[PDB]
């Protein structure tokens, strides 16, 4: 496969099951577009953290982590930072200035799938 991207959204917004699936599917479509990967290689998650807070406030906030073996560059990080923030702002009503995004580049010797390392 080479690279299987992952995107975990953590948020103190109590997202309904439907809104969660909507956000994750739009994020999955964005990741497939930017990283040029089929849906079968993409992992996504939304994790509700009731106690999370930003800026000393309990208002809506999202912390997004994107992890991938390849495709972690300035061009992709710029595009995905833009796309993911807009998706969350529209689907779960978080304000844009209440969205963090973190990009992590993993070595192929550090990642495994089906019990085998990527190389």
Own/partner long-range contacts of 23-29 (Cβ < 8 Å, ≥24 apart): 23/87, 23/88, 23/91, 23/92, 26/87, 26/91, 27/83, 27/84, 27/87
Binding site for a second copy (CB under 8 A): 4, 6, 10, 17, 20-21, 24-25, 28, 39-47, 49-56, 61, 63, 67, 72, 74, 77-78, 81-82, 85-86, 96-97, 99-106, 109-117
Q: Give the integer Cα–Cα distance in Å for 77 and 21.
A: 23
Closest contact distance (angstroms) between CB of 34 and a second copy is 13
Residue 86 tokens read as: 């807009």
30 binds, among Cl ion, a second copy, none (CB under 5 to 8 A by kind): none
| Region near Cl ion per CB under 5 A, out of 28-36, 58-66, 71-79, 93-101 | 58-66
């Amino acid at each position: 496969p080479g690279s299987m991207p992952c995107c975990q959204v953590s948020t103190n917004i109590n997202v309904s099951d439907d809104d969660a699936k909507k956000a994750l599917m739009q994020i999955e479509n964005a990741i497939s577009q930017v990283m040029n990967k089929p849906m079968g290689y993409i992992m996504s998650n939304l994790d509700y953290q009731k106690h999370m807070r930003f800026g000393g406030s309990h208002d809506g906030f999202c912390f997004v982590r994107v992890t991938s073996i390849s495709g972690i560059s300035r061009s992709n990080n710029t595009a995905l930072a833009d796309k993911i923030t807009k998706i969350l702002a529209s689907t779960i009503k978080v304000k844009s200035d209440r969205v963090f995004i973190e990009f992590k580049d993993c070595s192929a010797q550090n990642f495994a799938f089906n019990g085998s390392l990527f190389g």
